[PDB]
Amino acid sequence: SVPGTTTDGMDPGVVATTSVVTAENSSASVATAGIGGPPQQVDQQETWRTNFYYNDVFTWSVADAPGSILYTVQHSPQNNPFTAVLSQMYAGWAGGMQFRFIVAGSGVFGGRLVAAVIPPGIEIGPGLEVRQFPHVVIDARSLEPVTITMPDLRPNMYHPTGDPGLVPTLVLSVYNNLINPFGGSTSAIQVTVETRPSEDFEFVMIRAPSSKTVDSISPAG
Amino acid sequence: SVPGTTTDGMDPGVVATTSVVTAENSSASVATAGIGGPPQQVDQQETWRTNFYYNDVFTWSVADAPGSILYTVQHSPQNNPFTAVLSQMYAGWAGGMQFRFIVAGSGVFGG
Amino acid sequence: SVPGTTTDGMDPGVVATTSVVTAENSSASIATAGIGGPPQQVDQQETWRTNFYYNDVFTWSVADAPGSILYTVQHSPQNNPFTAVLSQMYAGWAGGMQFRFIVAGSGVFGGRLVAAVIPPGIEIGPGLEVRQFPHVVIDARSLEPVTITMPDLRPNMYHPTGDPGLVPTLVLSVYNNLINPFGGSTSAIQVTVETRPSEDFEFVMIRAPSSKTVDSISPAGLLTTPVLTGVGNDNRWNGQIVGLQPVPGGFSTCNRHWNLNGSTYGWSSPRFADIDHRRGSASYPGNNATNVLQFWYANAGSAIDNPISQVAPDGFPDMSFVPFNGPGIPAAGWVGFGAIWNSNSGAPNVTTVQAYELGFATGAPGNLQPTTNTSGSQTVAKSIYAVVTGTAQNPAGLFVMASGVISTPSANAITYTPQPDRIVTTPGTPAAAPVGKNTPIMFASVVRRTGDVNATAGSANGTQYGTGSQPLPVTIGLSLNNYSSALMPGQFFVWQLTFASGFMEIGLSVDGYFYAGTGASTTLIDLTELIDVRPVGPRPSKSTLVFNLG
Amino acid sequence: SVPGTTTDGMDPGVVATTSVVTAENSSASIATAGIGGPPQQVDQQETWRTNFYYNDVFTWSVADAPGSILYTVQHSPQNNPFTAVLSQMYAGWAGGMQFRFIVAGSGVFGGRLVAAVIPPGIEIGPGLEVRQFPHVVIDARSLEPVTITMPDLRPNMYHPTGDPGLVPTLVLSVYNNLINPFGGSTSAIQVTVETRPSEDFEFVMIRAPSSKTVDSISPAGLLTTPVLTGVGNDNRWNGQIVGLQPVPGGFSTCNRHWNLNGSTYGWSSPRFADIDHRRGSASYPGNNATNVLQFWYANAGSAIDNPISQVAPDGFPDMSFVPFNGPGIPAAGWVGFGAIWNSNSGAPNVTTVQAYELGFATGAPGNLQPTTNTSGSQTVAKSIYAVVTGTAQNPAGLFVMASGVISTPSANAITYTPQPDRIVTTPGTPAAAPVGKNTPIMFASVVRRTGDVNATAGSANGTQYGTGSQPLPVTIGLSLNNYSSALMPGQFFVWQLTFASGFMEIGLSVDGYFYAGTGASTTLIDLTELIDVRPVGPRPSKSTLVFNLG
Amino acid sequence: AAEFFEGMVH
Amino acid sequence: AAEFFEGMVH
């Protein structure tokens, strides 16, 4: 076996479930999303949905107070590159996603992080306390990756691409401060985020490629 | 089980006996001390004699030469707070005592 | 085989026991809480019971001597976010709680901590020797969390929600000094505390939520985030609270001030309305009656208009009268618009409209001097500008507006007008004294001045500040409820205020004063980039409130 | 064998079914609410689930025609006292409710009632034909209670707590007329409604209570008992609310008024502070400069001091300017103490201190007339008493105090000063119109007058009243939260106010106006012996609010 | 709840 | 709970 210091592309690491991954959520998500027709791009042998692929990176400083957010995403097909490629040629989606975190630190540091999943109706703002939600705490000395699964909790049957509606949110903030015992110039580390679709993710309606929508495209162009 | 970094109030740790803890010493200590009458405050379930309680603290410096004394006590009921409370209302004692040491250091030091 | 670097939200870690955790305690607690009926909210698979949730964080530095106290907590269902919501529909509670500690260090540090449970009846403070209790020692190099349990050691059969009674206290102290073998600037680590109910915590008797509400149990909701940001005013000037002013010497404020007993020693209601009095002697110096200053006075102890007290009429400022005469504007005086009216019918004198300065004086027809104690004093009005004519009627009355401005001679600003040297106080009120490193604070507000009415915050001529003792929603809420069973004498109710960069703590005493631990500094706190306000609860008064803006 | 004259707190009586209660509804509801996870708070032996608790009471008289609507209720967890407390810690809900009816009659009466469940998407009001739905008929001689169940007919998979969506409605109507065969004065009976959750009501997703709070979901806590008793003020005069004033014609109030969308059309913040403006022409009529009236004006649309709007400066009264000249005190004018200052530095003019009357006029240098619309108008100040000298500077500024008094010529009192004929209103605001028998109301307050400043409530010279549209805590709370998802257009949010003798109902529209069902009466409501205030919830707007003081 | 999924399966 | 009443009975 690999001795912990090398990791495969299909290896999640440890599994951290807070309280929202349930069997009835998946059974209600699969059965209700059949109103769009038979599911598409559902084959659990393809390379695009078995491996983790690069999504993001962020930095963790010594001077970050507890309760400050380092990473947030809404539930969307834009959090993986291949589902973002495939979403231009479909008009509906349902299901969840997995997020893999790798901390690039050493065994001399100290400090903890905290991650939680927020229900769809709650406003994400200054008065949000994520340590009074069901959460999970990650040490800064971890060597193996940690995987957190966000499910699809929705009041509608599916998510139209031009109008998804209400979605959950993944928030990652500081639990305790980063400590370097030697001091000096080294005062920050980096965390990398990978993504992979869950087993109950699907698309429904075929539509036309590069069709226009009732929402709005990202302001990057 | 507790993973070594947290310790209970009734936990001694490791046991170190040099050469003076013998069975005949205890058997001669119990049998001879009956000249004072029946023993008092002898009940091995009470909270005052099952837990370790605070007695002292001292410091260990780099500049301390080998052979220099850091801690000394004579054998007395003043080395525990509750036997010091109980000794004002008794006029005689016998038996031994246990001393627990916790070093507040790191794994990078030596000595 | 998961490693110790990843911890799950249901994971307690290593369970550290203490001799106060006994089986007969649990059996007696359940069998005597059975007089409230069957237990309620005791489903073991609920999400609010199984997970740990955040409580606090504190700092451990190398300069802390052995025996120094780092963290205390009193036994209450307000320590968990979800048992505080569920207490609004029940009349009793019984049981224990678990506390989880995570130390954020490395394997190169040294030093140890100590934790123990203190039975009720014992005073918590400096000099409490923790190492001569049954205790647990925790190393600074520990990677997994350590959880100890505080049981319910009570002399009642259950705790009523309004009046719980005597409770135990969990105290964490320093066993040995923290050691950094490298040496330098990195000398501090952080410990986080979380909480979870134990297996025998329950409620008993259901009741209507429209009974004794959540504002009559604890004063946690009296200080919220919009109160100190953009809604609240101060209790002296009725102006927007912008900052905090430390007073390292001490002060005593009597008027429009409420304690934690629903009582006041002053002479004003908690509102800003007109000041009206009758039967006072009016006069004017000199003989010519054009452009002549107006004088009015009346004795203390005679104004029968208030159901509260008759020292002064309602709305009178608690400031000593600065003496002045001639064409000179005084320095730091309470001035406000008003006129003198006729006592026989109530018809005001139209030509005697000007800005009158109010205060407390000793001899009004004789030589003028300020005074502080209300016994033997009198209330004195005198206009600062020239006014037309003057009525020499003996029972003549005075009518002034509610709010006032600062009387300044020049266009530049001065220090905070209400300095603690001159505050008029009824005899019998206590003063606010420094307790260790904690010093009393006041609430600053931008108040206009009579030399430049256009001046606002950040102006080139300087900013003028006036201070009050309490915010107005706080003293309004203190006069509607009673909080005798919320704070012992010798305790503070603590709030945590967070900013964009740092965070600080403030505390409220039984007497109704506010405190911050800053030492002897006199610098104003900016209080512009404030983000959130969170309650903490009762703490010992001889403990330093954390003050770091960075 | 217990008789029917004694009913137990867990007893439903006779279960009356309707065709909307189906098994596939329940199975679909549970299986589709399963996407929120496992159900929470579903223990069947809890005391808050097993008992019925009080909801309402209504009256059935002999004069009600068949088809008249007697009682409606919308589907919500706010109808039970204990599922409203438990909704503060969850983010969703699903399920039904049971409603128990007890008719208090005898065996000599006649007449029948009818009850049905209305699916969502259907407008509830007069003309809704209940007898052509699936219905249940209940006799007036029934001794045991009758309970029917309203299920959850929804197009969502669960109801979010902030935004539930479409819900069904339970309506009770008149089948046949009530008959008293004796005839006389005894022609009315009473029916009481109680509520209990059904076997499939549940919550789903836990959340922190420090999230979206209870003041952002429904405006039930905005109107409490101390607000109308002794704490609240009005939004025009900043005075103590004593009574209620019906306006049978109608009115429109714009300034310092907030709707249920978190928006205002006026030019004032929800607070009472100074009125300050610069760059306005100042003049004085005549040539002699001793005992001369002072004039000042400036155009509308130019005052760049407010981030809200530039029609008028902050704190300007929304009253039309009553014209006057010479030695005559005007009738019902807004007057307040103040002075004219110098715009170059901010130094006030000390000799120009008097009471100035404020209002809106059309031609300020020409002939004076009042105006209502703000387009093409201007703001005008003029002192009512004689003042010394006058500055003829063109950019001169005006400084007035916050609160004001009534300008009356004589020592006697008049009607409420702010009559609906003269209220200055920005174009674009809606008006308050009578809806059936419900008419708009205002909030009366005792306000002093300039002819007798000693006059209070109950005086021998009469009581002077000034009115406002909303209480001040209500408009403060309406500007901090948003309540779009709480009231459809065509609905009222109803509160029940009880007294020592009788009880009445008031309602709040989406536009922010208050209503009471009194018809064409103009009598003031005393509002002195008020005891309790209780929320009720959303009701149709074309339904008469009950008004009986006895 | 079981009848709903049973009917959709059948 | 049962042990408490059992001890008081015994």
Place of tokens 């052995």: C66
Residues D201 and D46: beta-carbon distance below 8 Å:
no
Cα C303 to chain centroid distance, Å, stands at: 32
Q: From the CB of residue A63, how many other CB atoms can be counted at a distance below 10 Å?
A: 11
Does D85 sit within 8 Å of C209, measured CB to CB?
yes
Residues 6+ apart with CB under 8 A from A5: A143
List the end-to-end C-alpha distance of chain D, in Å, as a whole number.
Answer: 40
How many Cβ atoms sit within 10 Å of the Cβ of residue A47? 9
By the 10 Å C-beta count (0-12 exposed, 13-18 middle, 19+ buried), C522 is classed as exposed
CA distance C356 to C379: 12
CA distance A95 to A76: 10
Nearest-angstrom CA–CA distance, D507 and D484: 17
Three-state DSSP at B76 gives coil
DSSP category for residue B11: -
Q: Which two tokens stand for residue D360?
A: 């809106």
Residues in CB range of B102: below 8 A, 6 or more apart: B7, C112, C137, C175, C176
Which residues lie below 8 Å from residue E7, measured CB to CB, with a gap of 6+? Answer: none
Distance CA C70, CA C67 (A): 9
In angstroms, the CA C103 to CA C141 distance is 8
D354 chain-C contacts, CB cut-off 8 A: 350, 353
The distance between the two most distant Cα atoms of chain F, rounded to a whole number of Å, is 15
Separation of alpha carbons C109 and C105, rounded Å: 7
Integer CA distances (angstroms), D536 to B34, D94, D438, D545, in order: 83, 21, 17, 12
Is E4 in the D-facing interface, judged by CB distances under 8 Å? yes
CB atoms within 10 A of CB D496: 17
**Cβ pair C323, C382 in contact under 8 A:** no
Report the C-alpha gap between D320 and C469 in whole angstroms.
41
The DSSP-derived string for D407-471 is E-SSSS--S-SS-TTS--B-TT---B--BTTEEEEEEEEE--BTTBTT--TT-TT---EEEESSB
Q: Is D230 helix (H, G, I), strand (E, B) or coil?
A: helix
Helix (H, G, I), strand (E, B) or coil at A33: helix
Q: Is C347 on the interface with D (CB under 8 A)?
A: yes
DSSP D170: E
Residues of C in contact with B109 (CB under 8 A): 110, 181
Read off the amino acid at residue C251. Answer: F
Backbone angles phi, psi at D506, to 5 degrees: -125, 160
C-alpha span between C340 and C347 (Å, rounded): 9
Residues A83, A151 contacting (CB under 8 angstroms): no
Beta-strand relationship, A146-150 and A14-16: parallel
Residues of C within 8 A of A182 (CB-CB) are 182, 184, 186
- Chain D hits for E2, CB-CB cut-off 8 Å, are 27, 31
Instruction: With beta carbons less than 8 A apart as the criterion, state whether D265 and D428 touch.
Output: yes
Vertex A177: Cα angle to A174 and A179 (nearest 5): 140
D497 contacts D504 by C-beta, under 8 angstroms = yes
Chain-chain contact of A119 with D91 (C-beta, under 8 angstroms): yes
**Taking the mean position of all CA atoms in its chain, how far away is CA D543?**
16
Cα separations in angstroms, D524 against C25, C140, C499, D314, D434: 64, 73, 50, 31, 18
Q: Encoding tokens for residue C343? A: 């006592």
User: CB neighbours of C390 closer than 8 A, spacing ≥ 6?
Assistant: C282, C283, C284, C289, C292, C294, C295, C352
- Cα D356 from Cα D369, distance rounded (Å): 17
Among C214, C350, C478, the residue to mutate for chain D (most D Cβ within 10 A)? C350
Secondary structure of D353-367 in the HEC alphabet? EEEEEEEEECCCCCC
For residue A14, the chain C residue with the least C-alpha distance is C2
Contact across the interface for B53 and C66, Cβ inside 8 Å: no
Helices (H), C237-306: none
User: Which residues in chain A (67-106) have CB-CB distances under 8 A to chain C?
Assistant: 67
**CA-based Rg of chain A, rounded to a whole angstrom?**
19
Torsion C368-C373-C377-C383 (CA) sign: positive
Residue A92, phi then psi, degrees to nearest 5: 165, 145
Task: Measure in Å the smallest separation between the Cα of C30 and chain B Cα atoms.
Answer: 23
The answer to whether A167 touches A76, Cβ cutoff 8 Å, is yes
Q: Which contacts (CB < 8 Å, 24+ apart) does range D304-309 have? A: D305/D276, D305/D277, D306/D267, D308/D264, D308/D266, D308/D267, D308/D268, D308/D269, D309/D266, D309/D267, D309/D426
Residue in C closest to A20 by C-alpha? C47
How many angstroms separate the CA of residue A89 from the nearest CA in chain C? 39
Residues of D in Cβ contact (< 8 Å) with C385: 350-351, 353
- Check E8 against A27: CB less than 8 A apart: no
CB contact under 8 A, A179 and C9: no
Q: For residues C503 and C494, is the Cβ–Cβ distance under 8 A?
A: no
Do C445 and C228 meet the contact criterion of CB atoms below 8 Å apart?
no
Residue D392 main-chain phi, psi, to 5 deg:
-100, 30
In angstroms, the CA D69 to CA C414 distance is 69
The Cα of A112 is separated from the nearest Cα of chain C by a number of Å equal to 7
Nearest residue, CB atoms, D158 vs list A129, A133, A155 = A155
Locate the chain E residue with the closest alpha carbon to A30.
E5
Q: Of C177, C185, C501, C181, which Cα lies nearest the Cα of A179?
A: C185
Tell me the CA distances in angstroms from D19 to C132, C198, D338, D474, E4, one per residue in order.
Answer: 74, 48, 71, 43, 20
C-alpha distances out from residue C323 to C284, C364, C369, C413, D116, Å: 16, 10, 6, 20, 80
CA distance C331 to B84: 66
Dist. CA C527–CA C538, nearest whole Å: 24
D48: left (phi over 0), alpha (psi -120 to 50) or beta: alpha
Quote the CA–CA distance of D369 and D385 in Å, as a whole number.
20
Residue A32 touches chain D, beta carbons under 8 Å: yes
- Cβ atoms C357, C316 nearer than 8 A: no
Q: Is C28 close to F4, i.e. CB distance below 8 A? A: yes
Give the C-alpha distances (Å, rounded to integers) separating C70 from A102, B9, C66, C113.
34, 20, 11, 10
Q: Which of D480, D460, D417 is nearest to D239 (CA)?
A: D417
A132 in reach of chain D (CB within 8 A): yes
DSSP-based three-state secondary structure for C407: strand
Q: B110 CB contacts (<8 Å, ≥6 apart)?
A: none
Task: List residues in chain C that are followed by a break over 2.5 Å (C to N).
Answer: none
Query: What is the C-alpha separation between D497 and C524, in angstroms, rounded?
Result: 47
Longest dimension (CA), chain D: 101
Is-contact C391 C349, C-beta < 8 A?
A: yes
Three-state DSSP string of C70-87? EEEEECCCCCCCCCCCHH
For residue D494, the distance in angstroms to the closest alpha carbon of chain C comes to 18
How far is the alpha carbon of D212 from chain A, nearest alpha carbon, in Å? 7
Q: Return the number of CB contacts < 8 Å for C and F.
A: 14
Token pair belonging to D20: 């909307």
Instruction: Identify all chain A residues contacting C194, using CB atoms and an 8 Å cutoff.
Output: 131
The helix (run of H) or strand (run of E) holding residue C495 is strand C491-498
Question: How many whole angstroms from its chain centre is CA D548?
Answer: 19
Whether residue C6 and residue A112 make contact (CB cut-off 8 A), yes or no, is: no
Angle at D405 between CA D399 and CA D409, to 5 degrees: 115
Probe site for chain C from B5, B59, B60 (most C CB atoms < 10 A): B5
Give the single-character DSSP code of C24.
H
Query: A142: which chain C residues are within 8 Å (Cβ-Cβ)?
Result: 3, 5-6
How far A4 CA lies from chain D's nearest CA (Å)? 35
Q: Strand, coil or helix: what is A30?
A: helix
Please tell me if residue A145 touches chain C, with a CB cutoff of 8 Å: no
The neighbours of chain F, by the rule of 3 or more Cβ pairs under 8 Å, are C
The two three-digit tokens of residue D431, written as one number: 């008006």
Q: Which amino acid is at C323?
A: P
What residues of chain C lie within 8 A of the CB of D344, using their CB? none
Decide if C256 contacts C341 (C-beta within 8 A).
Answer: no
Q: Where are the beta strands (DSSP E) in C292-426?
A: 295-299, 333-341, 348-361, 378-383, 397-400, 405-407
Rounded to 5°, the CA angle C311-C314-C318 comes to 65
Q: Count the neighbouring beta carbons within 10 Å of the beta carbon of residue C500.
A: 11
